[PDB]
Design a protein around this ligand. Structure first.
Ligand SMILES: OCc1ccccc1OC1CCOCC1
Length: 284
């Protein structure tokens, strides 16, 4: 059923809450035993948001290999994403260790450091060229190279140095700065513009490790980003672009991380983004 028609049918009936609860009821449940170990309590921002054991990212250390991060592997679309929480004061070194070990080219950030007057994640990147950061726990150095500030998002070029081997890599930081403190954007135009900028960079492409995506918990805005990308890629590949079922793609993704898409308004916004984005994918 063409999603644009399904959309008008749900909107006219006002059943967004009912569709959303059906997803929550059918969603996968797998164990998260490593996340709930007492040694990992300060590695988790939220008590109710944990990575499944089968899909969690492992840090390449013998001490403690745990980070709140999951590998979402979309087999038919041929795309991989790492979804993670906003780093905490005790996890910033771990974050950049993961970026290094997984060979990621891009980091996608969908929140501000402060929202609703509270801290949503640590200041984990340098703000001035001449004031670099060193993480002693993981032996990494991070330098700001350049910054391009636009109306809806900022792109930064960073240099990450493995202080152990003196290898360096360029990491692109894509920071969406205008998601509102409450609700979802009114139009998906600036979110879709942002997604096409990430794609253009090479960050989502198979010659790199998976892109790292985060918001505060790594399930809501982060969920919207990967669901929209995968749905538009599937519409490009399939003979019948009308066969793409966004509810079935979201349940497949929820086999790899719990809670992706946090509200009925985020589900509606995901439909709107895919519907509007397709009016490029189908040849405009
Ligand atoms: O590697 C630790 C570190 C080095 C340089 C600058 C800041 C910094 O850590 C701060 C506290 C913890 O949260 C992030 C900000």
């Amino acid at each position: 059923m063409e999603m644009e028609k399904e959309f008008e049918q749900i909107d006219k009936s006002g059943s967004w809450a009912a569709i959303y609860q059906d997803i929550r009821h059918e969603a996968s449940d797998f164990p998260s035993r490593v996340a709930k170990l007492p040694k990992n309590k300060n590695r988790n921002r939220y008590r109710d948001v944990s990575p499944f054991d089968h899909s969690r990212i492992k840090l390449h250390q013998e001490d403690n290999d745990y980070i709140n991060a999951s590998l979402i592997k979309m087999e038919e679309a041929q795309r991989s994403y790492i979804l993670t929480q906003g780093p905490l004061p005790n996890t910033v070194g771990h974050f950049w260790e993961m970026v290094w070990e997984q060979k990621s080219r891009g980091v996608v950030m969908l929140n501000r450091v402060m929202e609703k007057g509270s801290l949503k994640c640590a200041q984990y990147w340098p703000q001035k060229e001449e004031k670099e950061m060193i993480f002693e726990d993981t032996n990494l150095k991070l330098t700001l190279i350049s910054e391009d500030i636009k109306s809806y998002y900022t792109v930064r070029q960073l240099e990450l140095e493995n202080l152990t081997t003196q290898e360096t890599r360029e990491i692109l930081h894509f920071h969406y700065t205008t998601w509102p403190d409450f609700g979802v954007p009114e139009s998906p135009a600036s979110f879709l513009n942002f997604l096409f900028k990430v794609r253009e960079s090479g960050s989502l492409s198979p010659e790199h490790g998976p892109v790292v995506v985060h918001c505060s918990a790594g399930i809501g805005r982060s969920g919207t980003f990967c669901l929209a990308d995968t749905c538009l890629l599937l519409m490009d590949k399939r003979k019948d672009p009308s066969s793409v079922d966004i509810k079935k793609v979201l349940l497949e993704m929820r086999k790899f991380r719990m809670g992706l898409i946090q509200t009925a308004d985020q589900l509606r916004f995901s439909y709107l983004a895919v519907i509007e984005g397709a009016k490029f994918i189908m040849g405009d």
